[PDB]
Swiss-Prot record:
Gene that this polypeptide is encoded by: CELA1
Annotated EC: 3.4.21.36
Gene Ontology cellular component terms for the protein in this record: extracellular space
Protein name: Chymotrypsin-like elastase family member 1
Single GO biological process annotation from the record: proteolysis
Protein's job: Serine proteases that hydrolyze many proteins in addition to elastin.
Record-annotated disulphide pairs: C30-C46, C127-C194, C158-C174, C184-C214
Subcellular location: Secreted
UniProt keyword terms in alphabetical order: Calcium, Disulfide bond, Hydrolase, Metal-binding, Protease, Secreted, Serine protease, Signal, Zymogen
Taxonomic lineage of the native organism: Eukaryota, Metazoa, Chordata, Craniata, Vertebrata
Cytoplasm is among the record's keywords: no
Family, similarity comment: Belongs to the peptidase S1 family. Elastase subfamily.
Length: 240
């Protein structure tokens, strides 16, 4: 997250760190949202590579013991069937991970609340992106979980020529674009949390930013629109 501030430890208890085994250790690669005790919602693109993956819940600082972490292997990966790695702009950038064990819920580990199907936010709706992604374009991952205030940019604006044009689809949510604050590499798969009727809900799964850079004016961060996938999510969980 570029232009973020450090999240308080218990602000976003559904945020998870998706990690892969790298030698004797593990490397953070993507965010995710805990949606059942044994299911995580992430981006399809985060799991294109044939890697060994684990999920960390109750994580705050990637580089030190928080005393709150639980570590769980990924048992099964279900990518949306229409996802195409050669075409992120087509959408469908969403995947569900079934965990090998059910995690224990507490102040640091909670299920993310999802919006009702079909919900579209009015332009400029207040949201926060969270993640351990790069803190600058071509920079380094954060150590501590970061948050950035990123108001939505509706489909009509976001898909206009000076923004993202045809690249953005109605199955996506755009947020930010101020040239200062944005998602960045390593935030992919994580939540966009938006405040509606007094409650934060996870309206987005972080999907992409501009090839030109993370915080680029009029290139808001783009998210898979969770409310477009409610039936698909339920169908997968019910059949697995
Ligand atoms: Ca830690």
């Amino acid at each position: 997250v570029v232009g973020g501030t450090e999240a308080q430890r218990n602000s976003w208890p559904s945020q998870i760190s998706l990690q892969y085994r790298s030698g004797s250790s593990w490397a953070h690669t993507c965010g995710g949202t805990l949606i059942r005790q044994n299911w995580v919602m992430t981006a399809a693109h985060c799991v294109d590579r044939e890697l060994t993956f684990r999920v960390v819940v109750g994580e705050h600082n990637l580089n030190q013991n928080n005393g709150t972490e639980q570590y769980v292997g990924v048992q099964k990966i279900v990518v949306h069937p229409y996802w195409n790695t050669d075409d992120v702009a087509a959408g469908y950038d969403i995947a569900l991970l079934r965990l090998a064990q059910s995690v224990t819920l507490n102040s640091y580990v909670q299920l993310g609340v999802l919006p009702r199907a079909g919900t579209i936010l009015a332009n400029n709706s207040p949201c926060y992106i969270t993640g351990w992604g790069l803190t600058r374009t071509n920079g380094q991952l954060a150590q501590t979980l970061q948050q950035a205030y990123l108001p939505t940019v509706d489909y009509a604006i976001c898909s206009s020529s000076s923004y993202w044009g045809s690249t953005v689809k109605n199955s996506m949510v755009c947020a930010g674009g101020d040239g200062v604050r944005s998602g960045c590499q390593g935030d992919s798969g994580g939540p966009l949390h938006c405040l509606v009727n007094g409650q934060y809900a996870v309206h987005g799964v972080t999907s992409f930013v501009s090839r030109l850079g993370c915080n680029v004016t009029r290139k808001p961060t783009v998210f898979t629109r969770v409310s477009a996938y409610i039936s698909w999510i339920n169908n997968v969980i019910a059949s697995n």
